Design a protein around this ligand. Sequence first.
Ligand code: ZN
Ligand code: ZN
Ligand code: ZN
Lengths: 60, 49, 169, 153, 50, 181, 85, 320, 46
Amino acid sequence: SPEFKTFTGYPMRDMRPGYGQNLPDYIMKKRLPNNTHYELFARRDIPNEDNAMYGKYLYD
Amino acid sequence: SPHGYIRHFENEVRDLLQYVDGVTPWKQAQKIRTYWEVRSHHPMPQFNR
Amino acid sequence: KVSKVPTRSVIPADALRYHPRYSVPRKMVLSNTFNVVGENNRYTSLKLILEKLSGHVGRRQYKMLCNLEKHYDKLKDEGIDWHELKWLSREELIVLFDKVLHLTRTERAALLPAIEAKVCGVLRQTDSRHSTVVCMNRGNANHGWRCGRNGHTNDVYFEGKAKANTAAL
Amino acid sequence: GQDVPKRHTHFVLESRLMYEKSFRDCWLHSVCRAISQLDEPLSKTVVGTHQKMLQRKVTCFQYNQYGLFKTPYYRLANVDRYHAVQGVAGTREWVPYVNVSYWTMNKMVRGGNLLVHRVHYTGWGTDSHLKKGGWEHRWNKVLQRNVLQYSRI
Amino acid sequence: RCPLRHCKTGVKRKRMRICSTEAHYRSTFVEVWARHMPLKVGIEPISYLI
Amino acid sequence: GHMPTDVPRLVKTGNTRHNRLIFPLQFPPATHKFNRAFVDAGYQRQRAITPAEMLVVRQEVEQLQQRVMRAAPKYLRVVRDPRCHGKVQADFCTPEGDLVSGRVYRRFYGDRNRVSAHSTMRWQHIGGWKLLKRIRRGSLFPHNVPLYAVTKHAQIDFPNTLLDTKHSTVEQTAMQYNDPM
Amino acid sequence: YPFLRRPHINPSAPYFWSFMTAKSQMAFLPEENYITGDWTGKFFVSKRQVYTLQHATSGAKVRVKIFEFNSPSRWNIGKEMNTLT
Amino acid sequence: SYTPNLTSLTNQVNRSERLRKWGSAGVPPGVPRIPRLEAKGIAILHESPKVILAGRSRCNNFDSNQYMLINKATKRCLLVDASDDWPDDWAAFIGASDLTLTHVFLTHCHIDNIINLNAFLTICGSRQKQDEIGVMWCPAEECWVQNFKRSCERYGRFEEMHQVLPMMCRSLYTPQHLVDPVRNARHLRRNDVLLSAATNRATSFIDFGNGVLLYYIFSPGHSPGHMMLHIPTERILFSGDLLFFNKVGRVDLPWATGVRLAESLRLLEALPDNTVVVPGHGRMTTLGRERRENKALQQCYQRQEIGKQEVSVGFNEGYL
Amino acid sequence: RRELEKYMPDITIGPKALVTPVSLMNARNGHRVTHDLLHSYDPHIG
RNA sequence: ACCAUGAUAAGGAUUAUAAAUUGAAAGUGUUAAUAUCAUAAUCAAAAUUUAUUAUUUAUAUUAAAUAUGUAUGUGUAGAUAAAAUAAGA
Ligand SMILES: [Zn+2]
Ligand SMILES: [Zn+2]
Ligand SMILES: [Zn+2]
């Protein structure tokens, strides 16, 4: 509806109470977490950033 | 290589399911029961909520 | 009032040893490989004493001419340890030196100060994890030639670790 | 020193592998759950006993995989990499962009490493979508940018 | 002589001066009225000598 | 291989610090019929506790408390509250006329070697790590348990009680180092 | 705190099969009630294993992390060990 | 550290020791300036009817200290080892207290003492515009003021590198410039005191005003010229780097002799025990405490008793 | 295990059910095994 | 680890001689009390994960009783859109 504050022309949430992970219809239309922001989090968030750009033995 | 949803994986779903029955014998898969098949051994499984 | 500095009339000579903070140095415990005395850990005291008998000695760094490190590998495959070398009598050393080791008269002359003193092969603690310090105190026969001081008692291969447990080895 | 104690680095490196194990089998665990929990027929080709035996064969294939990463993402998505301070995702003791805790975020601000602009603590910043509807309206705007602007084929 | 009475730190620090103990108790309604805070456990520090 | 002693072994770990290493001399339990065949490996006993068992263990408690009361004047006195971040560090009124500050560790660290017959769950009750964590100041602490990094506080002649804190810094320095101006 | 996202996770007669149980009865038993591969034996089983008829029929060892169930009965069949304790 | 010549670049252990100390970087991180955060205020350490001692602890990342003697009668202030990372509080403190900064005492010319000396004379000299501030130092420290630029390269103080030191300028003890007859703010510094190594209790003092005398004591060993400050009326000894709490100065730096430091520790045994020694680093102590519980002084007299002719005492791990 | 298997039925396909084929590598981010530890296919790690 | 941190409270002053403007609002100084563990030789509290007759505060459950006599808190919280029993001795 255009007379609401959070107006976006696409349906952001479907009106279904209890749309969980156990239903296989949700599983088919869900986005897999491949090459997402989690893939950036797994390879970049290191306690030492120099251990992600080279090896320490190779640099030394 | 497909990316994103499972709807874009046509061959990989086909390659999985043929491989699923390929390694699995039916002598193994018969022992898995559902919930209502286990509940039938109760003195009363079924009553209305 | 002017307070006097507390000194002593009789002070041992090792108390003049230098520390950069003028304090007691750190006593770092040894590695986890020295927990159980095995065949890899038995001959590390024999390794270091033969290293010091071949390296440079003194403030002028006098090089020892005879290399006693070549006789280390033929000592350990026999199974004789540095602690087992102190239990050998005079009759058993002449059999070991002529037949097995083929020690010359000048190489036996340099190894005999290590045998006549019965130096205990106990790895002392250091400030580092890798320690090359052995207790150079003279051993007594009551404590298995282990010198009986600082907890080096009758089976102690390494300071800070367990006994020998000779039933296993 | 030095930067972190090594017990915390071994802890977060197992969390990186749990992300990598999550990328390994999130496709296979999802497709095997969806067929074994479907009672409607899969196709015109496979119906009746061919469907029921295939769902039982895919269930023991799901159960025989020792080490299948079925853990959800939000269970340990609060691990800090610079310090050992453990926060909880959803509250103010965690920031989602730089992925550190509240204690680490202040020391990066007080240290001057990252580039952040300070706003008055009772406002909504400067993005008009956040000032309009709050956190939920900006939560829908990223969905409109990532997915819903594309006419999918 | 008590070492806390003659310690070095107790010259400029008032906290390191009293060799005492503390007892815990369930406070009454009088103490939570006069201190303005409801303390279900009250703290009484005491110095004793037997 | 540890021989029982009552003399603590003092290992000087630096200036003004040392290490007190003494061990609390474990005694065998009573040999009555309720201590016999006790299920130790289970840790989940459901055997019915008769009141004869509770009266036998009441007399064993009075025998064990009579033994621990003989060592009670040789114990320490916790005078400051202990801090607990893994280790437990408090201050003690010793029975020598000294104020020490020692640390108590949870795991076992012997005076000669780390090898022992106890677990971590045992030694946390033996060496008083569970004790000093749960007690506040004004209570007893055993002398038989080992204390690590004990530092003796410096002493002055005149009492620091009823001293003015509004002195200047260089005369408060002279007052605390026993050389007043 | 977020809604029901705590990391550290009761009898009712009309909600017996729907409280702390699966949504559907057509869904199979979980992985804890089956043997995955070659095992040397487990010291405990998990609390989300559904009690079956063979638990009360054979009754060799029931090890729940402890809890040792030596009372076999038919009223426990059809629900996991979370409601049994 | 030193000049990278041909044999230092072709040495493998120079590339190996820089890997052990600093990891994969190889370049030592310098000693930076303390920012406006994590900085404390100026404290009033001592108040006496003659003078006032005001100080600030840990004013550098060398963990050095900054002190000032305030004369009550003459309203004249004097800085001792003027090295503060922020000499703007010290200018506001003397401006709000109606004080006149006349001289700056320097025990020795290491980088823990003269790093912000040009900043001290510029900021405090600008406030007296709305007679300049003198520098009192010993000419044996001439070898350390030449290597002030070398010390700033190793400790990362690049902003104070290209600054000519005010004690290097032409004073009254130097020949004068013959300028063209067709500017004396930097050409001539009339207020400059050069202290002599022949320090006695008779005539080697500074008349601070209203009858207090600042006896400077030459005590080398940590540095070539090390001038302590002793106020016998107030039992205050500015040891500088000679004596700290439970430790003494370093000898592992150039022009630092261990046997000169032991003779410097022996020339303070005639002072009373209530003399509150005020070091350049760390906490202040008394001279009676260091005669009892300092191991460096205990080793100095133990070697003297057993017959060591050249007693060598000194630290290798500590303060610069 | 032999007393465990009475009330807990045994489904042991074997190790062949843990190795997905080469055609399912890009669907599983390059992996073929379903072990609890990760597996690299280079000889330098091996 | 016994450094000389830092927080609390209290009193002072300058400007409006316009009916215009959406909007007549902004900058600068002194005393008391409290308090001050970083140049040194270690170790897993709640680094930290999990479970059992048992210790709480909360979570909801949770009832009788007119024969007489009867049962007043401090606090915890949300956004914030009323106002003169006390002596400028
Ligand atoms: Zn020895
Ligand atoms: Zn210096
Ligand atoms: Zn210095």
